[PDB]
């Protein structure tokens, strides 16, 4: 029955800075409380226990405080290995409860795509299938458009997007767009690109490749 | 690894799921044992607990009508158990421990199982290289890849030379098309080292028990 609230889902800060990471909760639970950071990819790793402890093996930038009902993990020298989902935990009384959790993105600056485009491989080939991909890697901010062209038509059907987490280097984005089309329809046609538009340029990064060729 | 999970599993709707947790070293009994449970829209929710040394246990009563937890002190191992599943109950679940003295918090969590409850058969993942071709060289660097497509359940890891390049890696989440997952994996190396130097994409397929490891052809 004791709810732990994290109002905030999401939080952005730049590197260097502070950022500040809030837990209520709905009854009283002293000191209580655990804090967790979860990386992509990973299982939660201990931070914080009893409010404001820090773990062994814990970075001295990661500082918890409270009692009562307000609790706070405090990052003061935020780095780009930081990016993660943290949440409190209550282990005053029974049963064990969590709050849904703060993501932390990076602020940096703006960054062009680099594209490398991909025709069906052989195998893919020979099993009836055929996948051509599109990597957009290490651009900001997040938002960017892709277009697929066969033969200079659009194509929707088909085309899977998909964005990695924030990088935990760069902190950068990165995309894949893969089109997928019957093995037919593949080599029937010659002409494929994939025409990505992102906020740093009004002219679309275009990457394209000849079937009949290459 | 300390707490070491079984693999990721599809179970037909209905059906029970029985989870494994190995715990390391000789310390088995210093531990009370936790599993929690992460429904990746949702936040954590724990399930329950259970004493090694005697069985004792203890429940989220949410849970408790459902959930059996045992030990086999001798393998030192955790087991849960879960009957009656439903789509609501595919999630990730977590093994987790904390010092039998006094509740820490947990102090270290498991790898975690992803349980997918679904009526659709398993089905392992046909592995695709991404190459370098017609590309433009792309500067000084050449980015790598391997295509992941036609399986299910969730998840798949990807590596590349065995664990050895994973500094340059992007790794995209799958999704779903016609019922089945892709997803990709790509990797930049300097393009001096192209040729010779080769690169393998290694993709573990817990959930249908495959592993298929893919050449890069030069
Ligand atoms: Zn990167
Ligand atoms: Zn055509």
């Known amino acids: 029955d004791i709810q732990m609230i994290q109002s905030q889902k999401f939080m952005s800060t730049s590197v260097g800075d502070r950022v500040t990471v809030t837990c209520k909760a709905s009854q009283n639970v002293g000191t209580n409380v655990a804090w967790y950071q979860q990386k992509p990819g990973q299982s939660p790793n201990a931070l914080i226990y009893?409010?404001?402890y820090r773990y062994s093996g814990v970075p001295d930038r990661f500082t918890g405080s409270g009692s009562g009902t307000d609790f706070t993990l405090t990052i003061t020298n935020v780095q780009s290995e930081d990016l993660a989902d943290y949440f409190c935990?209550?282990?005053?009384?029974?049963?064990?409860?969590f709050g849904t959790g703060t993501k932390l993105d990076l602020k940096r600056a703006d960054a062009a795509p680099t594209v490398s485009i991909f025709p069906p491989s052989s195998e893919q080939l020979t099993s009836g299938g055929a996948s051509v991909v599109c990597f957009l890697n290490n651009f900001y901010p997040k938002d960017i458009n892709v277009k697929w062209k066969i033969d200079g038509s659009e194509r929707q059907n088909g085309v899977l997007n998909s964005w990695t987490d924030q990088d935990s280097k760069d902190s950068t984005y990165s995309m894949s767009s893969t089109l997928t089309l019957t093995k037919d329809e593949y080599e029937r046609h010659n002409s494929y690109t994939c025409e990505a538009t992102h906020k740093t340029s009004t002219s679309p990064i275009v990457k394209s490749f000849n079937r009949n060729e290459c | 690894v300390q707490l070491q999970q079984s693999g990721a599993e599809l179970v037909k709707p209905g059906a029970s799921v029985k989870l494994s947790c190995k715990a390391s070293?000789?310390?088995?009994?210093?531990?009370?044992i936790y599993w929690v449970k992460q429904r990746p829209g949702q936040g954590l929710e724990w399930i329950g607990e259970?004493?090694?040394?005697?069985?004792?246990?203890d429940f989220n009563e949410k849970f408790e009508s459902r959930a059996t937890l045992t030990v086999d002190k001798s393998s030192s191992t955790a087991y849960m158990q879960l009957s009656s599943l439903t789509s609501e109950d595919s999630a990730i679940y977590y093994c987790?421990?904390?010092?039998?003295?006094?509740?820490?918090?947990?102090?270290?969590w498991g790898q975690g199982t992803l349980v997918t409850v679904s009526a659709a058969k398993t089905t392992p993942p046909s592995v695709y290289p991404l190459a370098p071709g017609c590309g433009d060289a792309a500067g000084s660097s050449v980015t790598l890849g391997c295509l992941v497509k036609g399986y299910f359940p969730e998840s798949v890891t990807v590596t590349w030379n065995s664990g050895s390049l994973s500094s340059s890696v992007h790794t995209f989440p799958a999704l779903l098309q016609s019922g089945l997952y892709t997803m990709s994996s790509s990797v930049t190396v300097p393009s001096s080292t192209w040729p010779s130097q080769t690169v393998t994409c290694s993709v573990a397929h817990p959930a249908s028990s495959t592993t298929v490891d893919k050449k890069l052809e030069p």
């Open positions: 987790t421990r904390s010092p039998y003295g006094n509740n820490y918090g947990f102090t270290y």
């Open positions: 935990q209550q282990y005053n009384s029974y049963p064990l409860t």
């Open positions: 070293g000789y310390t088995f009994t210093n531990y009370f």
């Open positions: 259970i004493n090694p040394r005697n069985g004792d246990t």
């Open positions: 009893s409010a404001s």
